[PDB]
Amino acid sequence: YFQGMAAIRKKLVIVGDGAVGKTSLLIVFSKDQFPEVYVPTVFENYVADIEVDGKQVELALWDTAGQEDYDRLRPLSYPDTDVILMVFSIDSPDSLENIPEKWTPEVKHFCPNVPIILVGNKKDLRNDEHTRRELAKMKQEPVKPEEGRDMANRIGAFGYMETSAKTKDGVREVFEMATRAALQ
Ligand SMILES: Nc1nc2c(ncn2[C@@H]2O[C@H](COP(=O)(O)OP(=O)(O)O)[C@@H](O)[C@H]2O)c(=O)[nH]1
Ligand SMILES: [Mg+2]
Numbered sequence: 001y002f003q004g005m006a007a008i009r010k011k012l013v014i015v016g017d018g019a020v021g022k023t024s025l026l027i028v029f030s031k032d033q034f035p036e037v038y039v040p041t042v043f044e045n046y047v048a049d050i051e052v053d054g055k056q057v058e059l060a061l062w063d064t065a066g067q068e069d070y071d072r073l074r075p076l077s078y079p080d081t082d083v084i085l086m087v088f089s090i091d092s093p094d095s096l097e098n099i100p101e102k103w104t105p106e107v108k109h110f111c112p113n114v115p116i117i118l119v120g121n122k123k124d125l126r127n128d129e130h131t132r133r134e135l136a137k138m139k140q141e142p143v144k145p146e147e148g149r150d151m152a153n154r155i156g157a158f159g160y161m162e163t164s165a166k167t168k169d170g171v172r173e174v175f176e177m178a179t180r181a182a183l184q
Contacts, residue, residue: 008055010182012175013062013077013111015103016087017095021121024165025087026061029175034166041065052179059179078110082182083158085174086116090143090162091125091135096151104155115158115181119174120148124164 014022026043027035042063050057062081064074086103088095099118107116125131126142135141145162152160158181163170 002054002056005056007049007058008183009058009060010082010179011060011062011080012083012085012178012182013064013081014085014087015064015074015107016085016119017089017092017098017103018066020087020089020092020095021163021165022065022085022087023063025085025119025121025163025171025174026063028165028168028171030061032168034168041070048175050175050179052176052183055183057179057183059175059182075106075110078107081111081114083178084111084114084116085119085178086155086157087119087121088143088148089122089125090120090148091122091128091131093135093140093143096120096143096147099151100155115184116155117174117178117181118148118152118155118157118160120145120160120162121165123162123170124166 016022023039023043030046030048042065046061048059048061050059062077064077084107088099149160159177161174163174
């Protein structure tokens, strides 16, 4: 008896360093497409339909960015948030360092009791030869899975998830988990 069942409305906010792939993640989830050209700073206003554990959910997707007006509209994004996606890039150890240094303090300040899913995006670059060579000149290497999991443990995240928006792998499961968290 699913027909006519009222949908549940929930709000998701996605944050993280510039160029880690926040907007690309939202477009892959919403449209089942990895865009490569003409991608905006933030994804269009979007409410996604998702069915999880038998519940019909309408999930509002709030994208954020990091300069000028976006520095100001970002803190205004947090009211009434039900789940946070906090993103770093596996090809950027620096973006992972900003998880405890910047993003977790900001989210705890404005969204104290809201579940956080820590997302390591660009997992397709972990074993990319060119990426590994560029990071090697800085004596760095791509983030290891256990390093992402460790950071998720440290910040009390609802979960740790890895994605490639480029291949689309893992993206559905991130938003399914976020929806389960939002329903809590
Ligand atoms: N290789 C790879 N590139 C990605 C991935 N996700 C995003 N990108 C690229 O990373 C850049 C930043 O993507 P964007 O979605 O604009 O990042 P945002 O600033 O966090 O919204 C673009 O060149 C994307 O094509 C991914 O999973 N793998
Ligand atoms: Mg963006």
